[PDB]
């Protein structure tokens, strides 16, 4: 387990970029929007309409989710045809193409380039969320398979934190360096191009997908570190048998069989309960929300939510195992509804009380803290536990489509719903946070 580190460290670089790309468009919203109006001026001798400047910037962040959907749809296409390692390596192309489009979008005076780059890197991120968990699982010793699989979540949450830090006026969240803020992703990509070619190919890919029974020996000994691996090798040949038993059902057969229509409904909802709860309302627009409240140094409060998120993710790991799943998803769904209530108060009494902007900070700090123990991980700890090795694939793909879709709904509609509800937006999240509470209380079984 010495070369094992390099193989994992090179893989998590994708999940770091996943988090970084999820939250670079938070702090620098004001500056890029100014570039949008300045570009609109140069083109049509006209100041941009505030409603278009809204739907346009919303499209700039939301189109990323569209890409993630297509990406998550294409995981299996590349992963079995080209292997796990080689897929992660070649798909660094999208990151490099993306970084150029976004980094040079200012010099090119084109919000299209920024939008188009945002879309592509989204595709990379939708593919990455399927490469990294699969590769780290098809490489780790069975014992460490649980722990090492954690790093995907950590990379995502840490990646968000780094993007929020770099989004300060001091570093790159300003008028001169926001193109470098979106482009810096090329450094992670370059680091993954240097590393990966030295990393091993998935033994399972060599063994099953490629029939390289003895070439798979070579990886396991250098990788697992030990001398021989007749324990590990046979373990893979037991899963391959168990997995090839029941015919893999397709997405189509999943909808049509009334045997699956109840658990699939539970899955899709648990996914909707993650995105429509409204965390990406903060992780996309935190800096904007805090400002509307009346917070000095709002970006720092966004860095705050990022730090809280990382802390409560390290915590969630020690809790999910030592407690039940049905309880945690309700504990989180409730604490979020409460914080969403806390928010609304601090957002109404602020016009009168100039200090509730401190309560709004606590509101979101706890709003994300409760998400990271409930609606965050559990939706995945249930889908895999609701299905066997036959329908679990098609279930994951559907649940993934549900996640990206509801993610696209918040990212694209939150600002449109904000210009109507005033300080009552989080009521909508509090409404849903209740409906989801009701649903999981009666219709979700414990596992
Ligand atoms: C895209 C979709 N879901 C995710 O990526 C969510 C969405 C999310 C979660 C938290 C957050 F703060 C922001 C977003 N994130 C993830 O890490 C997915 C995941 C994690 C562990 C195991 C899995 O099988 C999937 C997905 C679908 C199928 C496979 C992998 C991911």
Per-residue HEC secondary structure of 51-90 comes to: HHHHHHHHHHHHHHHHHHHHHHHHHHHHHHHHCHHHHHHH
Q: Which residues of 210-220 are buried (b: 16+ CB within 10 A; e: fewer)?
A: bebeeebbebb
CA distance 26 to 301: 11
The ligand 1 atom nearest the CA atom of 22: 13
Angle between helices 325-348 and 261-275 (to 10 degrees): 30
State the burial class of residue 46 (Cβ atoms within 10 Å of its Cβ: 0-12, 13-18, 19+). Answer: exposed
Q: Single out the residue of 232, 225, 360 nearest to residue 291, CA to CA.
A: 360
In this structure, how many other beta carbons lie within 10 angstroms of the beta carbon of residue 388?
12
Answer whether 394's CB lies under 8 Å from 62's CB. Answer: no
Which residue among 61, 72, 129 has the greatest number of ligand 1 atoms within 8 angstroms of its CB, and so is best to mutate?
A: 129
CA distance 403 to 408: 9
CA distance 216 to 200: 10
CA of residue 379 to ligand 1 center, whole Å: 9
CA distance 379 to 282: 20
Residue 406 backbone dihedrals phi, psi, to 5 degrees: -60, -30
Residue 251 backbone dihedrals phi, psi, to 5 degrees: -55, -40
Whether 404 is in the pocket of ligand 1, judged by its Cβ within 6 Å, is yes
Would you state the structure tokens that stand for residue 260, as one six-digit string?
A: 């699956």
Answer whether 407's CB lies under 8 Å from 276's CB. Answer: no
Residue nearest to atom 1 of ligand 1 (CA): 400
Whether 282 is in the pocket of ligand 1, judged by its Cβ within 6 Å, is no
CA of residue 133 to ligand 1 center, whole Å: 10
Whether 400 is in the pocket of ligand 1, judged by its Cβ within 6 Å, is yes
CA distance 185 to 420: 35
Answer whether 394's CB lies under 8 Å from 250's CB. Answer: yes
Whether 133 is in the pocket of ligand 1, judged by its Cβ within 6 Å, is yes
Answer whether 320's CB lies under 8 Å from 382's CB. Answer: no
CA distance 356 to 293: 8
Q: Is 403 annotated as a binding residue?
A: yes
The ligand 1 atom nearest the CA atom of 399: 27
Resolution of this entry, Å: 2.9
Which residue among 403, 408, 410, 411 has the greatest number of ligand 1 atoms within 8 angstroms of its CB, and so is best to mutate?
A: 403
Residues found in the chain: 447
CA distance 11 to 347: 42
The ligand 1 atom nearest the CA atom of 157: 12
The ligand 1 atom nearest the CA atom of 69: 1
Structural domain boundaries of the chain?
1-447
Which run of H or E residues covers position 336?
helix 325-348
Which run of H or E residues covers position 297?
none
Can you give the three-state secondary structure of 347-372, one letter per residue?
A: HHCCCCCCCHHHHHHHHHHHHHHHHC
CA distance 387 to 385: 6
Please report, to the nearest 10 degrees, the dihedral formed by the alpha carbons of residues 170, 174, 179, 185 taken in order. 40
Please report, to the nearest 10 degrees, the dihedral formed by the alpha carbons of residues 359, 361, 362, 366 taken in order. 140
CA distance 286 to 411: 12
Q: Single out the residue of 73, 128, 141, 132 nearest to residue 98, CA to CA.
A: 128
Angle between helices 298-320 and 280-293 (to 10 degrees): 140
In this structure, how many other beta carbons lie within 10 angstroms of the beta carbon of residue 371?
25
CA distance 142 to 383: 21
CA distance 395 to 398: 5
Method used experimentally:
X-ray
CA distance 241 to 442: 37
Superfamily name and number for 1-447: MFS general substrate transporter like domains (1.20.1250.20)
Which residues touch 4 (CB under 8 Å, ≥6 apart)? Answer: 139, 140, 141, 223, 224, 225
CA distance 9 to 191: 10
Which residue among 12, 14, 17, 156 has the greatest number of ligand 1 atoms within 8 angstroms of its CB, and so is best to mutate?
A: 156
CA of residue 156 to ligand 1 center, whole Å: 9
The ligand 1 atom nearest the CA atom of 404: 1
The ligand 1 atom nearest the CA atom of 153: 17
Which residue among 151, 380, 385 has the greatest number of ligand 1 atoms within 8 angstroms of its CB, and so is best to mutate?
A: 380
Q: Is 352 annotated as a binding residue?
A: no
Which residues touch 238 (CB under 8 Å, ≥6 apart)? Answer: none
CA distance 308 to 286: 13
Chain-centroid distance, C-alpha 224 = 30
Answer whether 172's CB lies under 8 Å from 181's CB. Answer: yes
CA of residue 149 to ligand 1 center, whole Å: 13
Whether 130 is in the pocket of ligand 1, judged by its Cβ within 6 Å, is yes
In this structure, how many other beta carbons lie within 10 angstroms of the beta carbon of residue 403?
24
């Amino acid at each position: 387990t010495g070369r094992l580190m390099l193989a994992v460290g090179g893989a998590v670089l994708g999940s770091l970029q996943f988090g970084y790309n999820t939250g670079v468009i938070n702090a620098p919203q004001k500056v890029i929007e100014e570039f949008y109006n300045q570009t609109w001026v140069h083109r049509y001798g006209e100041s941009i309409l505030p409603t278009t400047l809204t739907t346009l910037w919303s499209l700039s962040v939301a189109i990323f989710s569209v890409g993630g959907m297509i990406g998550s749809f294409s995981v299996g296409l590349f992963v079995n045809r080209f292997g796990r390692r080689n897929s992660m390596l070649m798909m660094n192309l999208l990151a490099f193409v993306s970084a150029v489009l976004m980094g040079f979008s200012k010099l090119g005076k084109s919000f299209e380039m920024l939008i188009l780059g945002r879309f592509i890197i989204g595709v990379y991120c939708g593919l990455t969320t399927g490469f990294v968990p699969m590769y780290v699982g098809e490489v780790s010793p069975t014992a460490l398979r649980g722990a090492l699989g954690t790093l995907h979540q950590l990379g995502i949450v840490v990646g968000i934190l780094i993007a929020q830090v770099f989004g300060l006026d001091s570093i790159m969240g300003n008028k001169d360096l926001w193109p470098l803020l979106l482009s810096i992703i090329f450094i992670p990509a370059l680091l993954q191009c240097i590393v990966l070619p030295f990393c091993p190919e998935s033994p399972r890919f060599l063994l099953i997908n490629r029939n390289e029974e003895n070439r798979a020996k070579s990886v396991l000994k250098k990788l697992r570190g030990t001398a021989d691996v007749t324990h590990d090798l046979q373990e893979m040949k037991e899963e391959s048998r168990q997995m090839m038993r029941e015919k893999k059902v397709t997405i189509l057969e999943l909808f049509r069989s009334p045997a699956y229509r109840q658990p699939i409904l539970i899955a899709v909802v648990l996914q909707l309960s993650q995105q429509l709860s409204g965390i990406n309302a903060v992780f996309y627009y935190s800096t904007s929300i805090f400002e509307k409240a009346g917070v000095q140094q709002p970006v720092y409060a966004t860095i705050g939510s990022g730090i809280v998120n990382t802390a409560f993710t390290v915590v969630s790991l020690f809790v999910v195992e030592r407690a039940g799943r049905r309880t945690l998803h309700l504990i989180g769904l409730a604490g979020m509804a409460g914080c969403a209530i806390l928010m609304t108060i601090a957002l109404a009494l602020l016009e009168q009380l100039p200090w509730m902007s401190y309560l709004s900070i606590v509101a979101i700090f706890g709003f994300v803290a409760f998400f990271e123990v409930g609606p965050g991980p559990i939706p995945w700890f249930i889908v895999a536990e609701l299905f066997s090795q036959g329908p679990r694939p098609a279930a994951i793909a559907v649940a993934g489509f549900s996640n990206w879709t509801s993610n696209f709904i918040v990212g694209m509609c939150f600002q449109y719903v904000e210009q109507l509800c005033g300080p009552y937006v989080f009521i909508i999240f509090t409404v849903l946070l209740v409906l989801f509470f009701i649903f999981t209380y009666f219709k979700v079984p414990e596992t």
